[PDB]
Copies of this chain bind each other. A is one copy, B any other.
């Protein structure tokens, strides 16, 4: 809410809220797509680890954080990728590493396919970008409805160690879900039948086998939203890829496994 709000810049036509920390090689973080989500809520623990050696760019995708929600915006993969390229052009960033969490991972893969010249290394965490049967969990996430109780439960789905889902955490995230116009745009994106959306965010197997990017796929064994089976698949499709699965870990690999995650990612990028 407070620190979830960073800088403002006109990207690809929309006023975008984002974070720009660190200097050097650019690294873009794309948050997932849950109610109340934001660049900062998804990456406040990761950013510090990377800004010690990189310039971390963590924006709020069109209609998600505190980024404007255009009066008649048509949300789609292409739109979101146009937004990502918008932000990169506004900041005059030619090539950058991309870290995508689920919804963000799908976008990352989509972006690496359509704008190869702007993407270097990729980090896909419980990423989207490949078809998989909608899970009860994902359905819960996209089907969210404002309510401290619904949020808490929702958060339970993401974590493996429910112990991390504290009342305070539940309240705070809930508050964000009911920010001015947040639920509005959110409940308008992945309505009732959902398999469609996952398929719309995915990239064909053929295409993906094209990706020449050095890639790190991270997934929690017990991920309840995005099935492990989905990353194992990307581990097959992508050529220059590494696959790392955490045990006793939910979807938010970067939270439940902050240390291991930041260590793997930072080292992964240091290779370049």
Interface status of A41 (Cβ within 8 A of chain B): no
Complex-state Cα separation, A248 to B244, whole angstroms: 15
**Is A240 among interface residues, defined by CB-CB distance under 8 A?**
yes
The closest CB in chain B to the CB of A267 belongs to B263
Q: Closest 3 A-B residue pairs measured CB to CB? A: A243-B245, A241-B247, A244-B244
> Beta-carbon contacts of A237-261 to B below 8 Å, as 1s and 0s?
0111111111110000000000110
With A232-B232, A263-B267, A267-B263 in contact, is A248–B243 under 8 Å at CB?
Answer: no
How many monomers of this chain does the complex have?
2
Q: Which residues of B contact A243 (CB under 8 A)?
A: 221, 243-245, 247
Q: Which residues 213-272 in A have Cβ within 8 Å of B in the complex?
A: 221, 232, 235, 238-248, 259-260, 263, 267, 271
Asked, given contacts A263-B267, A267-B263, whether A240 binds B247 with beta carbons under 8 Å apart, the answer is yes
Residues of chain B with a CB closer than 8 A to A242's CB: 244-247, 260
Interface of chain A, helix or strand or loop or mixed? mixed
A-B contact pairs, 10 of them (CB 8 A): A235-B247, A238-B247, A239-B247, A239-B248, A240-B247, A242-B244, A242-B260, A243-B243, A244-B245, A259-B271
Q: A221-B235, A243-B244 are in contact. List 20 more A-B contacts (CB 8 A).
A: A221-B243, A232-B232, A235-B245, A235-B247, A239-B247, A239-B248, A240-B247, A240-B248, A241-B247, A242-B244, A242-B245, A242-B246, A242-B247, A243-B243, A243-B245, A243-B247, A244-B244, A244-B245, A259-B271, A263-B267
Instruction: Report B-chain residues with C-beta under 8 Å of the C-beta of A263.
Output: 267
Task: Write the nearest CB–CB distance from A161 to chain B, whole angstroms.
Answer: 13
Least CB distance, A63 to chain B, in whole angstroms: 35
A223 CB to nearest B CB, Å = 13
The complex places the Cα of A194 from the Cα of B257 at a distance, in Å, of 40
Interchain CA distance A241-B247 in the complex, whole Å: 5
Minimum CB distance partner of A215 in chain B = B247
Instruction: Bits for A84-122, please: 1 = Cβ < 8 Å to B, else 0.
Output: 000000000000000000000000000000000000000
Q: Kindly report which residue of chain B lies nearest to residue A263, judged by CB atoms.
A: B267
Closest to A260 in B: B242
